[PDB]
Symmetry: D3
Subunit: 167 residues, 6 copies
């Protein structure tokens, strides 16, 4: 039993961690796709795929989740939404269930014939990439939205410095 | 200390496994990039990236190598060899050493300023994707060139059936 | 004498039908290009090219227009507006006149040396993809804006269901 | 009942016509995809998609096949064979059966779950794009391999003149 | 000592000229990259790269700047900001200093390890592509923002006519 | 009167120089397009566009040809030969005559309506990129085929070292 979760992870926050631990209670393995693997240095997608890979690795590792229970696979976006499901399948191990709270993602897999489920959201007004990125820019409390290990990576790559400069 | 290895892994053979265990003796972690992640169903690149991810996962796992010691990251090829090193870096965690026996790969990283090393080859006349794929086509002994787990995956995805049909 | 008309046809509405019958009074054949053939599942371009091909086929057929009087050719968009006219010509039979109400389309063909004409609009405040898509979303009367055959296709492909989910 | 046939049609020869009439005896409509719609001016793909559209139109029309029994849809090739079936579906009306004599085409649809059938070949040593193009270049009898209407189009677009110059 | 300056030059205005003469006082040669070389016919990027090449050529020539002191190199944009610096380097002669007032440009070169400097702006509220294009559209005084030679090119290519039509 | 010449310039040899001086006797300015600006590090296209820009700059400058008499514009290749002429025009100043000895180039401009002329070749068995690259690889006398300034650039960028490694 393998599940599939896809997210920009810009950056990886507590919302992601919480939902990932939750899904891991009903699937043997979870394929975690890092979307928009080609985008970086924008207000929407500030970090590279490589950097986001380090965030998921540190965070999940620090939380005791065995590395063999998941797959971190970067997936570049594509112009055709009609070929996106195929794009994912082409780059990943087989999977039986899709977990997503994203309308487009849910609909594209739903139409292809996959069972998709939308997990309960955890503090959806605080745990979202949009809010995190906004706090980083306007000096709000963003550290409280991310696992300590992600905060460490963000400091090592000078993420706040970059995002603020670009703005 | 993180190393970087890149290969088409079409399919993942004993040559790859042998060299990977070897590199793991001098680096803490090895980033294993599955090249040509967009190609599949050709004589040169018969298996999808997703399928090759299952091969590396099974093989390395079956050989006792802890999953936390490596990264399996699919990387699509790009038209510009001059941007390829950057392409890799954009999709991966930082790395200090590049291990490659591929002339182009060695030269592109060498020019960018990375230390590249070419490990000793293991039965280079038998352990190569080219030979494996040729045996699969002409009914030679290809199973002896691959870890048992890879053979299992090849049978589950009907790899020989596909490669033979396409030919 | 062959004319050329290009539209997103998202979806094909009475405005399109009306103008098509009109153009068919001064040209022997009309090449109808379905633009943005690669886009689908967005608020702006909800239907695939394949689906829009079924809409034009049903609608024109139901209206008695002989199939030999036109060409339904899907054309993907391209990044370079300067090569777009060439892009069209590369995928279509020769044509002598361009019929368009779209500023960019008119200007790109005008600059290339083609005679372009902007036909009289039919209820431009009701017969537009934008209005149709808005009514489908906000439960307005969208069926009255489309030929009955297009409504049938929209129901068979669950168009309203998709567009509403994505929103 | 709709069938699907895909070919480079470089150029459209008697082999294509023969097989098309044959398929039309067991399907209500045939979707004829003109592959490699973006390639032109090479020894392998000398004619543009637009030109090949004129060839299929003239030939099928001249042979009395009602235009409403088929779809001529140009489809550009794509880098990923794994997304090609999806690419086709995205640009075409639904179809129940795939007719192909091309190994790759047969295998990609076969794996996606479509019933594919390979029709009897008609003079496979004479009716092939390769042979036609070779005769055009080496002054052989190529006109006998094509429907008279295709020969007319080839003369109107100066096809032999182009192919010979490029060589 | 070679410097590098990159701009959309839509169109080339007095602000560009002023800053270019200024940079030429501290560098032996200036590589002037015309960005977005693939975009044209939009409100943001109205002129083609070819047209903008004629503008820089006329303007710099008319101002007595020897042609051997600079390079006019069109550079298409790319989807990956992480590969953009590499993209530039791949298309240009070596350079030691980057001159830019653009946040993203400054940050991408800064991160790659290049010394970047932001020159003093000249009438930043008047000398900007945005203002020029706005005046051309709303009949303001745009000619006063551009070197006389650029105005001549704009008239020869019917730039105002195009921009107004598209709007 | 502006002419247009296009070449891979891999590398820029005496054949190019000779023909360029010749064309400059019948045109006021020559637009020199460096084709395949995106390719590099292959046996066919070993040098980047940036490097080839330095070769043309040094060579033409050393030969006393005023820099204002020509344009060095890198042009990336594109998948569609049917849009290539448009691609060139989009990136260049207007031109009245095309000078080429390349069959495809001649035919694509010829069909678009441009007057194309094939200049007399200078030692076509020695002055060709193919021969130069072969001598560099097999230790033949390649320096005699190139202007001294190009040889200097090739040594500064370690061209022979790169080409030999890749082989
Ligand atoms: N055509 C294409 O290329 C295409 C089509 C669709 C989607 N995509 C890609 O999908 C990615 C977008 O993912 P996204 O916007 O959902 O990213 P995201 O990181 O904001 O969210 C990822 C997912 O994580 C879960 N999640 C997030 N916060 C949560 C919280 N607080 N509590 C519980 N669950 C939570 C949800 O399931 C959500 O959809 C992008 O990379 C996008 O480009 C690509
Ligand atoms: N521009 C680009 O997109 C670009 C440029 C360069 C390379 N690439 C990619 O690089 C990949 C090619 O990798 P490849 O051809 O080397 O693949 P491969 O799987 O055949 O070999 C991978 C590497 O594994 C090692 N290896 C293999 N067999 C071995 C053996 N028996 N003993 C010891 N070591 C052994 C070598 O270091 C070798 O280079 C492709 O995906 C290619 O597209 C892409
Ligand atoms: N570079 C590029 O890729 C590029 C450049 C230009 C245009 N395009 C494509 O052009 C397409 C856009 O077409 P559009 O926005 O005009 O689509 P549309 O379907 O909204 O309208 C198509 C045309 O139909 C006619 N029409 C529509 N409603 C009418 C009515 N009520 N009465 C009379 N005539 C009516 C007009 O001539 C109009 O321009 C897209 O596919 C776009 O991507 C592509
Ligand atoms: N990834 C991709 O982009 C991808 C993958 C697969 C195929 N394609 C496309 O498929 C097209 C190739 O089609 P092709 O090589 O088969 O073209 P073709 O015109 O040579 O043949 C088309 C088909 O017509 C039939 N046919 C031809 N001659 C016949 C004869 N004498 N008697 C009976 N039947 C006959 C066969 O079914 C054959 O496969 C190209 O456009 C190719 O690019 C694209
Ligand atoms: N990924 C990518 O493809 C990518 C990433 C970054 C940037 N770009 C490209 O960079 C280009 C954008 O350049 P831009 O927006 O800065 O163009 P611009 O022409 O508006 O400005 C160019 C530069 O000229 C200088 N300048 C302009 N007006 C001046 C004035 N009045 N006084 C002094 N100096 C002045 C500044 O240094 C400025 O950044 C585009 O082509 C964009 O696509 C591409
Ligand atoms: N679709 C596309 O992207 C497309 C289509 C056509 C051509 N191209 C591009 O065209 C370029 C190829 O140019 P090429 O192969 O001719 O390069 P080249 O450098 O070998 O030759 C360039 C030209 O220089 C002249 N020349 C060369 N040697 C000469 C000599 N000894 N004496 C006299 N004249 C001489 C000839 O006119 C010749 O065609 C590539 O960049 C190719 O990709 C692109």
């Amino acid at each position: 039993m393998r599940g599939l979760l896809v997210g920009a992870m810009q950056p990886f926050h507590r919302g992601h961690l919480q939902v990932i631990k939750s899904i891991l209670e009903e699937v043997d393995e979870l394929i975690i796709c890092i979307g928009s693997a080609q985008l970086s240095h924008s207000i929407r997608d500030p970090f590279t795929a490589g950097e986001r890979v380090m965030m998921l690795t540190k965070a999940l590792s620090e939380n005791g989740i065995p590395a063999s229970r998941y797959y971190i696979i970067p997936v570049q976006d594509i112009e055709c939404n009609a070929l996106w499901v195929g794009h994912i399948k082409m780059l990943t191990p087989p999977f039986d269930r899709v977990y997503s709270g994203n309308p487009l993602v849910q609909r594209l897999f739903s139409e292809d014939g996959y069972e998709v489920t939308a997990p309960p959201l955890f503090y959806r007004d605080r745990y979202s990439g949009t809010e995190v990125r906004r706090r980083m820019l306007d000096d709000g409390d963003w550290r409280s939205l991310l696992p300590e290990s992600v905060v460490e990576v963000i400091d090592e790559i000078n993420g706040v410095e970059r995002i603020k400069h670009l703005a």
